[PDB]
Symmetry: C3
Subunit: 174 residues, 3 copies
């Protein structure tokens, strides 16, 4: 397949994006590292970690710093959820802009390859509360910045992956 340094996989909830990333990583022949961002505070979350369940590294908050110091040419890092990392930062009261831009810059310079698995959260109605609105905005921005940084971007819909980067973007004259 096409040789790259960085892939962003975007999909909705229970879209198959994690299975797509996990089977791409398992097919790669690299040393696999799951970068796990989910805080197993309850059994529903441990349940989703168990279902997905490789070297496992927890990175609930320091995702970018973890990528920089775990990435190796011989390793493939899979970020289990960009979304759950952002959630962790938001709930704590952290400003989300700097870590997002820091992560995109990191995505551009790793010592080894990385797949980022991230949710689309922006294609429903406006949330009725400011925390959910901020989260929706920050996740949308984050996916834009990661798509710009990464070599390749795939959208996963109903378990089917479509490549959207590389790809020529449309141009219109008026």
């Amino acid at each position: 397949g096409d040789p790259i340094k960085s892939l962003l996989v975007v999909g909705g909830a229970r879209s198959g994006k994690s299975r797509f990333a996990q089977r791409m990583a398992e097919a790669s022949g690299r040393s696999l590292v799951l970068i796990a961002t989910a805080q197993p505070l309850d059994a529903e979350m441990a349940d989703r970690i168990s279902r997905h369940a490789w070297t496992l590294i927890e990175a609930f908050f320091d995702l970018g710093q973890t990528l920089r110091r775990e990435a190796q040419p011989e390793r493939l890092l899979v970020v289990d959820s960009v979304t759950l990392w952002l959630s962790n930062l938001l709930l704590r009261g952290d400003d989300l802009s700097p870590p997002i831009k820091d992560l995109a810059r990191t995505a551009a310079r790793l010592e080894g390859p990385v797949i980022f698995v991230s949710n689309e959260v922006g294609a429903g109605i406006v949330p009725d509360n400011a925390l959910a609105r901020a989260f929706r905005d920050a996740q949308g921005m984050c996916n834009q910045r990661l798509a710009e940084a990464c070599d390749a971007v795939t959208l996963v819909t109903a378990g089917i992956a479509t490549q959207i980067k590389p790809g020529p973007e449309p141009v219109f004259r008026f």
Copy 2:
């Protein structure tokens, strides 16, 4: 057009997915059967049944069994909503995993052709309640299993249909 046994049409709310399926079925020249899953409990729901309004068969709960015993080579079955069928099972307190996997297996062996019309519900924020979270998960899984089972899959966005299966899925080397 391309001859197939099974089509999954996925789209958001008021996306045109039902019109796409209905005009494909009307253009087919087969005997048309609407498999209606919507329980007309209120006038908003009867209103949506009336707007869409062929042999009409109600299948509020027993969707797969209804497909197996209504499918014929000369017939095309259209499932008006996978989503409203899942909703019916969820609200009752049914476990959703077995009927979903049963339906995908059914989608693989009918005596005649079928179009499944289903919603994408996974590309908004995490629901604030466990019933809605379960439903979101089950609908995502269901669309994955139906996409795997069906000959063809179309995504309908703003009334425009894009074929995503058949189609080569992307491969990356790292």
Copy 3:
């Protein structure tokens, strides 16, 4: 690039759709007009107007009439948000069907070119209230009618634009 009269840009929240439309318009060499539909009632909304911030024309309610009387061959009109216009009509208690169909007809006959920027809101769960359900339905219908009316339609996901119109739509035989 491809010469057209009318483009619909659809995306989720913080998808990059506004940046895609703004940089297409800035690259065009036409006289630029922002058709601004957002009512700056609060600082969050003024904040989003300021971030996006060309001749600026407010059209909170009379969007179609504003397009007809501002469109010129030498001008490109960008509708900053179809979604916030619909929101304005909904909250007031207006019926949304006629203005939507009026706008699609307008999109078909302008004296000059137009880009419509609109949200996808239909790919989450069913809203728990009738106002949000109506809005979701009306926005879905509106995007269908504008996609039918416009020369070209682009979906923007994670800041990446994919053209879906023009494009041959799939056909299946059963």
